[PDB]
Amino acid sequence: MIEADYLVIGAGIAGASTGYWLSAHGRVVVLEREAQPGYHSTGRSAAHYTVAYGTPQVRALTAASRAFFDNPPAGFCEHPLLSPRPEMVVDFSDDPEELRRQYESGKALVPQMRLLDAEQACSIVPVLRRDKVFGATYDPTGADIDTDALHQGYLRGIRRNQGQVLCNHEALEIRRVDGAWEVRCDAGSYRAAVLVNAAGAWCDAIAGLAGVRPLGLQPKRRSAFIFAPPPGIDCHDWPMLVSLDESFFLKPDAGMLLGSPANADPVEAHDVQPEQLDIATGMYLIEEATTLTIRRPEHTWAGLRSFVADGDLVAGYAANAEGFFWVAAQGGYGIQTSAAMGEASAALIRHQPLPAHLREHGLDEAMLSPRRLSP
């Protein structure tokens, strides 16, 4: 039996970020089922940062994370965590009212957000079919996140603070014993006053082991693929391109193009594989919007974006289950919100007020709590 102050289940971006901030204050042990911490959703994302995405809570958590991403502590990473990648949202269906509403809402959080005419959008991504383009919004402040460096920075930070990150440690049994939570894995047993449930799409399964009422988390499959651009076009500086109705996105990645139908098909938590229909739909939508020809994609994959009913993230203690803390419902936002989520969850776990910089973005206990869910 190994004792800790905080026992975290899951070493994806959620558990790693929460563990990182906790590790400054006590002994953290993170238990991870897989052989590597980023095998599931955290290693399968499109890795983009944009404030104007998701619910108001998500936008606040994303905005509040930028300070850390732009100024992490010395030794956290070797190179910047963010690289410039503006986002251009293109109207392909001639909906000027919706385009205006997205522009106005985005500009309220991003003063530099711009409204583009069709010619401006096509100047930026010249493969757009001009007769299908009706205008766009443009966020000059978007960025790509180096997920590997961020995730490894969190994990290394735990270990440098005398915490432990234990892979091949699937939590199999969980029990409240003598005022603490005890977790049995095949390799070893662990005890801590606080159990942090950061198990991604499996958070409700972890609650099931513990006898704690689950949240109603719904994992949803999203597939993506990479394909080669035609030999004559340099697309490496293109923005992240999204359609106005979120039917697809397309962004440069490692000399290739990364596409997705931006799907969200509800599934059980599992090691999710891409579906042929997903890939074909994404290819069709990109070929409908652009002059690109997509041959058989060179690599395809899928990951899970897991949501509760209201689309907001969850960080808070369970009602009626002492010491059981949810870090859940990251949706499609877990990487871009991870700095604010990690710092806020650590404060809440420790029963401390949220730091002032988070409060200035409108973050508080109530907006994050699982107890807002009803019934």
Ligand X SMILES: Cc1cc2c(cc1C)N(C[C@H](O)[C@H](O)[C@H](O)COP(=O)(O)OP(=O)(O)OC[C@H]1O[C@@H](n3cnc4c(N)ncnc43)[C@H](O)[C@@H]1O)c1[nH]c(=O)[nH]c(=O)c1N2
Q: Which residues form the interface with ligand X (CB under 6 A)? A: 9-15, 31-34, 37, 39-42, 44-48, 170-171, 198-202, 206, 222, 224, 260, 303, 305, 330-336
Residue closer to ligand X, measured from CB, 12 or 297: 12
Of 233 and 280, the one with the shorter C-beta distance to ligand X is: 280
Give me the least distance between CB of 200 and ligand X, in Å please: 3
SS (H, E, C) the chain: CEEEEEEEECCCHHHHHHHHHHCCCCCEEEECCCCCCCCCHHHCCCCEECCCCCCHHHHHHHHHHHHHHHCCCCCCCCCCCEEECCEEEECCCCCHHHHHHHHHHHHHHCCCCEEECHHHHHHHCCCECHHHCCCEEEECCCEEECHHHHHHHHHHHHHHCCCEEECCCCEEEEEEECCEEEEEECCCEEEEEEEEECCHHHHHHHHHHHCCCCCCCEEEEEEEEEECCCCCCCCCCCCEEEECCCCCEEEEECCEEEEECCCCEECCCCCCCCCHHHHHHHHHHHHHHECCCCCCCCEEEEEEEEECCCCCCEEEECCCCCCEEEEECCECCCCCCHHHHHHHHHHHHCCCCCCHHHHCCCCCHHHHCHHHCCC
Q: Which is nearer to ligand X, 115 or 267 (CB)?
A: 267
Q: Is 273 annotated as a binding residue?
A: no
- 171 labelled as ligand-binding? yes
342 annotated as ligand-binding: no
Nearer to ligand X, 23 or 42 (CB): 42
**Shortest distance (Å) from residue 220 CB to ligand X:** 9
CB of 97 to ligand X, least distance (A): 27
Nearer to ligand X, 40 or 59 (CB): 40
Which residue's CB comes closest to ligand X?
12
The distance of closest approach from Cβ of residue 43 to ligand X in the complex, given in angstroms and rounded to an integer, is 7
4 labelled binding-site residue: no
Q: Is 135 annotated as a binding residue?
A: no
Whether residue 24 is annotated as binding a ligand: the answer is no
CB of 99 to ligand X, least distance (A): 22
Binding residues for FAD, as ranges, are: 14, 32-33, 41-48, 171, 331-336
Binding residues, as ranges, are: 14, 32-33, 41-48, 171, 331-336
